[PDB]
Amino acid sequence: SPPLSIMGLMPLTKEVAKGSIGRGVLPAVELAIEQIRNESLLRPYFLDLRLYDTECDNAKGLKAFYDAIKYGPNHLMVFGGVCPSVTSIIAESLQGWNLVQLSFAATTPVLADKKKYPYFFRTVPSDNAVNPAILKLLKHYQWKRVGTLTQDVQRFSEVRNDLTGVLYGEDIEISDTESFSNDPCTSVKKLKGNDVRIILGQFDQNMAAKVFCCAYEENMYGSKYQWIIPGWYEPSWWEQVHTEANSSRCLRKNLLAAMEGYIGVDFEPLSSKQIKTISGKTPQQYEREYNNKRSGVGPSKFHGYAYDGIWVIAKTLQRAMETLHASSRHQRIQDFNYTDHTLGRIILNAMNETNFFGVTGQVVFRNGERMGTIKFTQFQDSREVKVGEYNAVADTLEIINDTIRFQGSEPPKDKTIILEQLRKISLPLYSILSALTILGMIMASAFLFFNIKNRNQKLIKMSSPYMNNLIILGGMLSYASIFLFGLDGSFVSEKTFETLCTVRTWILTVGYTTAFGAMFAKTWRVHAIFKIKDQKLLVIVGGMLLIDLCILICWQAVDPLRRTVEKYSMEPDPAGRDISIRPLLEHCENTHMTIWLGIVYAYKGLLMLFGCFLAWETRNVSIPALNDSKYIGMSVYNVGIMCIIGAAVSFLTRDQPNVQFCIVALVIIFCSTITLCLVFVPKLITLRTN
């Protein structure tokens, strides 16, 4: 039974700070060989394991490596290596002799580049097996606005570089990305100014006290935030790193209430369930046997991820040894002068595929890295508790429910609420103006009653019935316009809003026409005085109104002047809590607002100017009591001035919707009451004289 031996390098003495770890894993392998020795799968051979010392030092490690090469038998693979520098130095220079290295505690991310590490495998989930599980947890709580805060070391930059490639494809965006070297909370102040609420951190154990105290001053705690932190720190790491001979810049009792309920992400040492594994015993059997197996050496947390790795090595060698050739193959596995490249290839390619249930679940690989299990923890009452699990082959996340909680009564939100709001008219103003217009309508009804009452009285001058009736009918029809103007979107429900603005224009144009006709009747008399028909002047004012009204009705039949709406996003806190509200307001416009409105406004201005010329020319035509050429003149000058003011005002006050309504209302109501009183009340006083 010729033997075959494998090399191992680990710290051994007690004078170092990381020796017991080695002294933590030496009994576990001491079981597995006996378990082989009780079955002897290698029947014509015998397994041998050589152990040496490195003390995680380059000079001594390289000397021991060279001495083991020079004065040793034919070795096949190398297994071990715990210090994060000598491991990399070996693996980067492992290709010259064609061996494969297997580690069980090296969790540094630089060993993931298989462009310069072709011959390196590990049986422990590294720090890149955390990035999938967290994303799926987000898909359990719908968190999308997230911010990252990282240090600047190698392992904390490899994780941040891997996060984009893992988190690519989904609808989650990284809002901020900061990096500090000695002062963290200048960027904590930038994250405060950017208003983030979910924080994922990557920094070592030492910087955490400083980050949470200066982050505590900026108030990024309470029931409004959530921190995701790596969790391979030693237990109770805060009751003593905070003391640090004084570390006065942040005290204890104003920090324990600040770092409340952060989420820690780590891996899991053992399996909770029970099936029949590859050995033939339960995980409980192996844990009891290990716990009564050691004599006085304190326990470690890595003896399980290496106890299965040794059995992995035995099964790969057994699956690689038995190829088709036998005699030449035993000559070929005893002629190994470290030059057989083909033997290295058949070892790597046979180790590449492996699938069985070990002691930490199924042992399956992906590009060298083991698919494993992830454990979640949360901080409650100055202690850490386990809250979840994440499978990798089934891609499920199990939450131990009846345990987790939150500071409020619900999960927090990623960002505040955007609320759109319309700007409404004041209801007391609308009620008052509507009541005043209604009173004017009633007064107009009384005036029409008077006009109809003495409709057949010789003392009524028997002159201009129809023109005064038409003036007062135009005024009655115009008061309904200011009744109709002050609408709102809540009281129309977008049912008649697309029609009321252009029938407002309809009624308005009718009012303009009747106004200009009662204007023009005076100028007709002045044209007669500056030198056949019963109803032709009425006919001609109707013809003018009809031609300019069909001009409007067809122009607007073609013009679908409809509703629009703009917004002004300057959202403050009105209620004081957090709902950001923005204002938006509607309109009724068209794509040709300059041409058509400019044309109609210019023609109304031309009519007003012709009336102004007639009023300038005529002051006294010696008219008898049948005419009242002075009141009409006073009315037209007060109308032209009031209109050209209300026009320039309504074209200007666009950003104040609660003054232009009251302006157009006062100019219309005031103009109409003054015109009707100046027309009517001299006759009213005459009738009062009787």
Next chain:
Amino acid sequence: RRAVYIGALFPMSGGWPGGQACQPAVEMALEDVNSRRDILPDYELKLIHHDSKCDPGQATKYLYELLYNDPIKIILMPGCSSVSTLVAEAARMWNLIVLSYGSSSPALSNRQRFPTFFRTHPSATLHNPTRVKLFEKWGWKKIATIQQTTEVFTSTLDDLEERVKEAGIEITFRQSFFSDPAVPVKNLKRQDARIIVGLFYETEARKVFCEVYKERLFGKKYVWFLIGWYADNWFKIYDPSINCTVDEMTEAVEGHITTEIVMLNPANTRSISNMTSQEFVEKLTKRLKRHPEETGGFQEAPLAYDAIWALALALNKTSRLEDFNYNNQTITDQIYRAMNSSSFEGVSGHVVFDASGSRMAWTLIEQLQGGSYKKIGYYDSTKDDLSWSKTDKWIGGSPPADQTLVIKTFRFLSQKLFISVSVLSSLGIVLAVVCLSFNIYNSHVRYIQNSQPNLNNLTAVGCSLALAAVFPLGLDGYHIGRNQFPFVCQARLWLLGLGFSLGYGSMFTKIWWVHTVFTLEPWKLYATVGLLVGMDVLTLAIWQIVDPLHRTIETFAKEEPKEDIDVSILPQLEHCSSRKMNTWLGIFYGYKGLLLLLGIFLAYETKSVSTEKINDHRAVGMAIYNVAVLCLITAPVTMILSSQQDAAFAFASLAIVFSSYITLVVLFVPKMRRL
């Protein structure tokens, strides 16, 4: 003669091919040191060289080959930095001496970890006294870095960020990558930095510049800082490991800044080997085979040429070296004591490798224009010398910057709207005083029959002082509005408070009498009017001397001028106001408006006759009604409209001019009527 052996690693490919110019140079040195009978009477030196590409794998294999072969070796001569660090860390267990010649890591200065290490190459922190200088000439404060994660660049970046803290400049954005730089460049583009300093190898230089082409992070507002010891055409070679093309790098590397260190004595001296410097240059260029412009590692030949001579002089200083084992100490310390006390002159000036480094002084700065290299200017570290040459060609003749923001006050039409109002005021201000003069000199029976002209002189003076108030109203920050701006608004307020009150009172007292007479005069009404106006005078002077209106800036308008410059304008507008205005102005306008309504009430309450005094009541009633309605319409508008660019000035000016015109015509129509 006996023979001794040295071990050497010469990198001839990879991230820094130097050996192609360094292997013949050492081969030019041994034949000169083995020909002088002074330094070695009974010994010969032999060389065992090996290629490494400065990759740690082949380096480890050949190191194992050297340490366990025959015969026994004496010194090792490493190459690139990853092997120099590996050999220096590993050589403590065999008691050897490491002498590097191309490593420039600052972390090799820590003598506690590296006891037996010497080098002739200077430290890499010599670039940091330079870069800060180019940061003070062009005036920048926000930069950004990108590096390849080897400790040689981390320590240099640490020293730069340590020494930049004193000049006020501060780092803002850091990035890192180990082998694939796509995500840091994408994030840097998304963060939009403008001044970038790169620290990476040559092949990663190509694999980042084709991806900076693929992310459009170049052009007019981006500055790139690089290293200087690359080849002259390090982008004109064919590389199958990339997808980019040559014109996508020709447009990518235009306008970057490179810094290097000079390495040759420019003077004309005599060395220790009886040879000047350009004759040495001529012999070396003759021994090679390709052109010296593209031969890698051409600048570092005299350092290796002095690195051999120093050990030669040291070996003459020791002068029993034939039974040297790998476990005896008394020779390693004897040679160490002989090497610590050595200093002489060689080819690179005086050679004294015993310091904390930093024995060279000068540097050299270059830029790339049109596919050609150009030397900008030298530098000295000690005496702060800076031999500028004025040849830097930016885009537009000026270097870029980050982004800024200008502050702009508003103005208005200082000619068209102002000179027209001024001439329109001047047309009437003289007619006012000539009609006043006509009121003065016309001592006439019928004018005595009309009203007493003192109350018309009051109205005229009031309207004159009101008319002479457009000039304090139209002036702004264009001419005078620097210091006595509160006094310009004060002039406005004094003129306004006088000129309205005087004329309105001079009408109101006439209307008061013409009311109270109808259904003593020479002294009763005038004195109570004088009292009333002095009351009005007191009201302005009370809260004009207790809480005046000095200045107030209002800023509303937004960012983003969206012009061809990235600058951002912030518009504001200044006007004269106290802390509280909407109470005092409101109460004064209402208290005056009540008096105006009372005046129109008194004008309405009797219009019928006039007797023995004057009969101007219809005209003065119409004029005061017109002025009243015009003021009542115009005045509450200018309080509402805050955009006073073309509305609030124009409305008030039109109101003032129309009121003045109507007052004048109503006042001096009956004179033309009666004459």
